[PDB]
Write a protein that binds this ligand. Structure first.
Ligand code: AMP
Ligand code: AMP
Ligand code: LEU
Ligand code: LEU
Lengths: 910, 910
């Protein structure tokens, strides 16, 4: 009994000897017994166990451990809970004396409690000790012998350790963990210690089908469970490589297949699992079997040794999930109050006649609803595995029947009747029929009635159709926001053509490219701008100078000639920008949806401030003009001042107004008359950061959608912040005749809480890109879920629990194996909380392709705050690894031409 | 004049447009003119320059730049300094308008001021502009023409940039900077923005000899200067690879050899220089020539692009030193108030007829004395290079004649007469002659006079010499601190033998190894411990039981038989420990020095608390007994309580007391009677962290030395903290007959402020190690500076400015290319400043050989403080990269058996 400590034993000792009273290494176990007991023999049982297991009578000399053959257990007392309260709270004490480092107590209402230090025992070792203590009692409450083999002394683990070469195991852990730079994030967990148990019981049938499959193919039930969890983790995380804990014996020699012995050995090990698109479930399970066997050959270096030895940063865990397969005077419960640490999520497979799978979760990290669904997913995956193991791993189903249905069917039940026969201009002219005298457009003093607008529109149409314009014609429009411009738009539409906005402030070369791209032969403009057009060969008509030409022509409505498939407009998104071909159907849907959702009626006064090259302008003009309301063009002057715009909105008695996101953010800080005409403010285009105060008189509607889907895809009222609310307002839910899908990189559905790529199926979808047939086919695919078409948005989003969508960002800004476990927007929200921070954006890399170095751009309210005081504020709220290297104070955000924040113009730090 | 910005131009623009008014990019230049000036023509001169250089009339459109041929410079006014005060302070303003971004002003007392933005100009570009503006004035204050070629438009740099492939330059900067993980630290700089200039003028002879050498060997004067600085940096830094800035043209096409042109180009580039032990100066200079040429081929990516692209962490500079070779109505001065940034140290070679080398230094980072010496070093290196360029680079001299002398000769002038004929026991017995009745030893109640001790010593000697003991005999001593033990020690010495302390608390196996190592055939012990000796074959004598045997023998002094070369003691240092063979000469020197320095006289009462296996015990016993004083053995009880020991020291009227370092640290926090007998407290053994309060009644002496050099090498009084003081008390200066040397890894001398390895030349040096002849030869070498022997200590130290030595740590704990620019002890001192921190130790790696992760172990005063609040405190005081990843709260430091802090028993974090 002269032996050296294991490294793991030393570490532990030193930690205890020189850090203040800790109890990190104190494991308690508490046993509810009922019946009656021969106390005398129950004690002698414990003494029997203490007499046989050498560690249960070891002591430490301080670099050396001694087993003696002498000490045992002390009871303290026996004979309105009062146990937790004090009687269990008060243990900061163990001496490395011969006296077994294990103190016990039996009680009045019959409760046993065992305290011990991990320097002698393992999580594995306690079960063995109950079993052996119960068996020495039952064969001895009956004067018989409980015959058991003599155990190994655990002083021969120690010699075994020394026979092994640490450099072998260290090279192996280094080689195999190399690429792996941060822990697999579960991304179903909560922003910010009690644990709970969700029991997921598998049917007798599934249990048996699993066992069967294991036998047929030389796999174990533990491998099927780990596999199941590996598959689940890859879907939740988005990573095709995952890493979780598995529990192991850690005691070797192939006594893994015969014997059982007590002490401190390695009990958990990291298992790194990769899943490729070609992987089939049988082969991949064969492979998993090996890696789990293989890692056990290098089980003679601690996990702390393995953490540092990896590429994972110091300070952070290399996994947040653990899988344990418990291969194993009546007892009532064994409550384990080693609560001192536990992993956020541990999945415990207990292989009784039916397979139990317990999910033990940190309740600060996961909702009950999230965990229950996790249960459903494993259940789905396991049933899928036995049902057809020839299947590709990346295609195996995860959602339950009810989930599938809810997400893909019920939440997509947005079908709505709308006039699919009609066209934009028709609707308009019914509007101009029924209320000819109504103010249709207003610009400062100027004013058009529905008749003025219809008549002057019909004239330009007639002019235009003499010039060659019909269905599918693309006519340029190069004009300042004005009445002329509405007439222009309406003119092209009536001719049967489709308008191509040309922005008045564009350089002459970009205007060039648009005209050559779009192939327009005709551009409507105005004398002011005429000379800025490049000379491309195209005719230009001035609606100001040349109005005389146009006046000559009929102000009659013409025959309606366009079909819903005909192009209505072509608008560029941001190598070059790409023009999107929008048909009339799209717009009909939008208009009919919009008018319904926001109850637009001819009473309404509707603002028009988006520049005509952005598709928001479509959604300002046509719902309004086709409904009878009055469109108020806004001087861009007014828009330059949030408070002035506020006053101006109030002044002009505007009822419903679209404000782009950066602007609406600002007006929401202002204070507002309580009784104004403004009922709705619509916003969208960039990610809205801020919830409205309840003080706001209007209701605030968030909206989202690509240009490739007729302006709006998703819409939702935004209330004041509640509590269960995400860090930034939802983008709402799909609009009429729109279905959405949140999909993984192999086009597979994902459950609530998991981020994926938004795909859209809609009557709103573009015909495709102008002159980009390849890309049209890459992005507009055949829908896996219907006979209809699916557009890939490239936007990263997740379903919230009531069916709202959280917008996260762009799929291209995601990098594999550096997903941070905290969503960037979570930091943003936190930084924004501290007053003096008005707006924060957090980017991954503003530097180039070498490093990433996450930076945070802050716009301050006053100069009081600086990048140090901020830094400590964020390491107070989050930990580190969740705090950026650089913080850049800005004065204002680089906005692109439409209002969206311009990333590539953000200043790179230092 | 349609052109895209350079990347470097864009970055700059964005930074200006969206960060709050900054003036980071504002360069000012201020020109003292005297004489009289045709104001009218001076202006027109500037207009001439503005008319020719395209950037001097460029504007920015916001991704595009425009040159116009129209704007120029405005004067604002003209006609008790008041300029700095306001008139120069107030510039936060430049608009990217056609109006040249360059505002000027001429003044009353004749001062010109030019403000411009780096988005148009370079540090290189301003000189060209003065020259061209002065030349258009002088040929025009005389109605003549100043004829100059027409410049390149700098719109063809931009096309050149675009013709180049960034991936080529990026691969090159990545490949060549790879190993290089932190900036070359100068380690002559100060712990913690004004600049100063030290002019270092080289003689006409040296200037010319350099130029000559350049011609002979196809090198330039710039390469000789960079070389010089590279050599200096490697010595200061301790790194055989260095990295500094060099300035470059950045404008290419081989117009580097003809033309001169204005704009913004790359001006600084990182030059990585390696120096190997075999390198010869000619070949190595040839090579340096190439690398400096080569790097200029990749001069089309910014330095910010090169920083991130390197292995240097984000946030930190990749060099703190820059070398610029300025190859280039009278003007008085050009004062450059672009002070907005400058590097901590820039070395400017100005190649006028004699070579000037300016050292421009941040005065918060370097003392005037440090810089002057730097000047002397370059001067030394350059003179060395011309004198013999066949020389090895690592052997070239750096110290001046006076420095060499001061460090190696004058500060080592410690020769002292001492009785080299005599031996320890002789001196003793003269002491026991002259004052037979004096109390020699005291232990609680027990007491020996000089006669008791001498007589009982002579008896044991006679006993011993019948048992075979003589010169060179090693006798074991295995005894509790007691009177018997002093008698034992004194007995062995008189017999002519040398004692080998065996520690009473050692395990029987370590005792075994010592006895087999030392080969003792005889061990003096005591009945108490006899049975703990292992049975090795050696005789044991009990000075307690067997005293009767010993009493029979003569109490006469014997003939003195030992010579000063004879062994006196053998003591192990901490694979296995190694026994050190100390002779009598060593001890004579120590005793005679000690008695002189601390004025020991027979009045003195001297404490004895070091365990006998530590060599401190030698330095407690023999100075005292050989002087006539009374040695008080201390109960180790008393030593367990700082306050009790204090009281006990005061109580017993002890005059001079050795307390090991961890203990003295603690007593210095106590409060102290002002009038006590205690005059000196001696300490040493570990690094003392704390300076005494002035309130302390005694004086506190720090001391240092390896066992291999008779206990003490260096000694120095420690006062209260002053200001210029290092973070922890000096270890003083060499003792009698001791010379020290602070040397680099090629055994070369180093100047003040530079850390190196301490080597000792002394009469105190061990004969060598017991039974380790190899190691004796590796560590005890032939002295490069005398005919005498040199011991390599493995300790890292530096000379302070008055000749004190700062102890830094162990050479083995240093790792190349991760030296931090801040000394660990600097952090320690800072952490210690904050009350609630009683003691802090900062280690490099407590984890294993994969990462390093610098950790800090803190002992707190009360539990109030925690590892977060500490963390922010240290990122407040230092920046980051100077703050550890882990902080471990301890309760107490793992001490080894002698008092030194035990590193390998520090708890590894997490
Ligand atoms: N409400 C919104 N919240 C967040 N991002 C949005 C929102 N609306 C639009 N987007 C983003 O803006 C894009 C539309 O850009 P484009 O169609 O090119 O003008 C979408 O694909 C999203 O990435
Ligand atoms: N005063 C001191 N300050 C700092 N380190 C010290 C001091 N005295 C001794 N040392 C260290 O202790 C060593 C002596 O250890 P040893 O001779 O083996 O007992 C030296 O080589 C130093 O590294
Ligand atoms: C949802 C709307 C605000 C328009 C959206 N920004 C788009 O780019 O189509
Ligand atoms: C300088 C003295 C305190 C002794 C020193 N610690 C040594 O190890 O020799």
């Amino acid at each position: 009994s002269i032996y050296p400590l294991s490294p793991m034993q030393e570490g532990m000792l030193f930690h205890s000897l020189y850090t203040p009273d800790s109890g990190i290494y104190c494991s308690q176990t508490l046993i509810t017994l009922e019946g009656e007991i021969n106390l005398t023999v129950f004690r002698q049982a414990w003494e029997k166990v203490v007499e046989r297991h050498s560690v249960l009578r070891t002591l430490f000399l301080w670099i050396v451990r001694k087993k003696v053959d002498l000490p045992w257990d002390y009871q303290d007392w026996r004979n309105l809970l009062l146990q937790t309260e004090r009687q269990q709270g008060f243990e900061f004490k163990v001496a490395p004396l011969m006296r077994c480092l294990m103190i016990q107590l039996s009680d009045q209402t019959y409760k046993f409690l065992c305290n011990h230090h991990h320097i002698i025992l393992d999580g594995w070792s306690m079960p063995i000790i109950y079993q052996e203590v119960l068996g020495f009692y039952e064969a001895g409450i009956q004067g018989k012998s409980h015959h058991l083999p003599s155990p190994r002394p655990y002083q021969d683990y120690i010699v075994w350790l020394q026979e092994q070469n640490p450099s072998v195991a260290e090279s192996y852990w280094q080689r195999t963990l190399e690429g792996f730079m941060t822990p697999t994030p579960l991304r179903v967990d909560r922003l910010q210690p009690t644990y709970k148990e969700y029991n997921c019981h598998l049917s007798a049938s599934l249990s048996k089908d699993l066992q069967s499959l294991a036998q047929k193919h030389n796999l174990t039930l533990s491998t099927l469970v780990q596999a199941a969890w590996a598959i689940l983790l890859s879907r939740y995380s988005g990573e095709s490589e995952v890493l979780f804990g598995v529990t192991v014996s850690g005691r070797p020699h192939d006594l893994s297949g015969v014997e059982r012995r007590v002490g401190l050995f390695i009990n958990t090990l990291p298992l790194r699992v990769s899943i490729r698109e070609s992987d089939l479930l049988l082969s991949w399970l064969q492979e998993l079997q090996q890696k789990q066997a293989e890692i056990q050959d290098y089980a003679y270096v601690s996990l702390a040794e393995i953490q540092r030895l990896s590429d994972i940063p110091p300070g952070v865990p290399l996994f947040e999930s653990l899988v344990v397969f418990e291969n194993y005077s009546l007892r009532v419960k064994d409550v384990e109050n080693f609560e001192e640490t536990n992993y956020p999520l541990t999945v415990v497979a207990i292989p009784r006649q039916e397979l139990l799978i317990q999910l033990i979760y940190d309740t600060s990290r996961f909702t009950q609803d999230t965990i229950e669904r996790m249960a459903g997913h494993l259940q789905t995956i396991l049933t899928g595995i036995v049902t057809d193991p020839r299947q590709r791993v990346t295609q195996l189903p995860i959602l339950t029947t009810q989930e599938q249905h809810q997400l893909l069917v019920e939440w997509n039940n947005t079908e709505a009747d709308y006039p699919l026969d009609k066209s934009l201009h028709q609707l308009f002219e019914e509007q101009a029929a029924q209320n000819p005298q109504g103010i249709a457009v207003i610009f400062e003093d100027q004013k058009l009635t529905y008749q003025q607008l219809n008549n002057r529109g019909n004239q330009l149409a007639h002019c235009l159709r003499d010039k060659g314009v019909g269905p599918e014609s693309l006519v340029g429009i190069f004009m300042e926001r004005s009445l002329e411009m509405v007439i222009g738009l309406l003119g092209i539409l009536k001719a049967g053509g489709a308008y191509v906005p040309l922005d008045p402030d564009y350089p002459t070369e970009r205007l060039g490219d648009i005209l050559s791209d779009s192939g327009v032969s005709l551009v409507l403009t105005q004398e002011s701008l005429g000379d800025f057009l490049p000379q491309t060969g195209a005719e230009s008509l001035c609606l100001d100078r040349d109005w005389e030409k146009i006046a000559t022509y009929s102000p009659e409505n013409h025959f309606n000639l366009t079909t819903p498939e005909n192009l209505a407009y072509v608008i560029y998104t941001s190598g070059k920008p790409k023009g999107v071909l929008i048909s009339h159907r799209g717009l009909m849907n939008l208009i009919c949806w919009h008018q319904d959702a926001f109850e637009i009626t001819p009473l309404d006064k509707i603002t028009q401030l988006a520049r005509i090259a952005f598709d928001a302008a479509v959604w300002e003009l046509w719902p309004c003009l086709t409904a009878g309301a009055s469109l108020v063009l806004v001087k861009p002057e007014i828009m330059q001042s949030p408070p002035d715009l506020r006053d101006w909105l109030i002044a002009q008695e505007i009822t419903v107004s679209f404000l782009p996101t950066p602007l609406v953010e600002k007006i929401l800080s202002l204070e507002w008359d309580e009784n104004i005409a403004l009922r709705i403010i619509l916003t969208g285009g960039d990610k809205l950061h801020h919830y409205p105060s309840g003080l706001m008189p209007f209701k605030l509607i968030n909206n989202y959608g690509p240009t490739e889907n007729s302006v709006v895809t998703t819409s939702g009222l935004v209330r004041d912040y509640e509590e269960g609310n995400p860090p930034s307002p939802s983008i709402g839910k799909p609009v009429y005749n729109t279905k959405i899908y949140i999909l993984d990189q192999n086009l597979q559905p994902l459950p609530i809480g998991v981020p994926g790529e938004l795909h859209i199926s809609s009557v709103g979808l573009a015909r495709g890109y102008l002159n980009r047939l390849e890309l049209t086919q890459e992005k507009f695919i055949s829908n896996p879920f219907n006979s209809g078409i699916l557009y890939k948005t490239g936007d990263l989003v997740r379903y919230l629990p009531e069916g709202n969508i959280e917008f996260l960002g762009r799929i291209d800004n995601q990098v594999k194996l550096r997903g941070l476990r905290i969503e960037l927007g979570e930091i943003e929200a936190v930084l924004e909380t501290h007053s003096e921070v008005e707006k924060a954006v957090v980017i991954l890399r503003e530097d180039t392709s070498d490093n990433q170095r996450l930076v945070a751009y802050i716009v301050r309210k006053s100069p009081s705050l600086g990048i140090g005081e901020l830094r400590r504020f964020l390491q107070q709220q989050l930990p580190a690894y969740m705090v950026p290297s650089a913080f850049v104070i800005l004065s204002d955000f680089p906005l692109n031409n439409n209002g969206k924040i311009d990333r590539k113009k953000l200043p790179v730090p230092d």
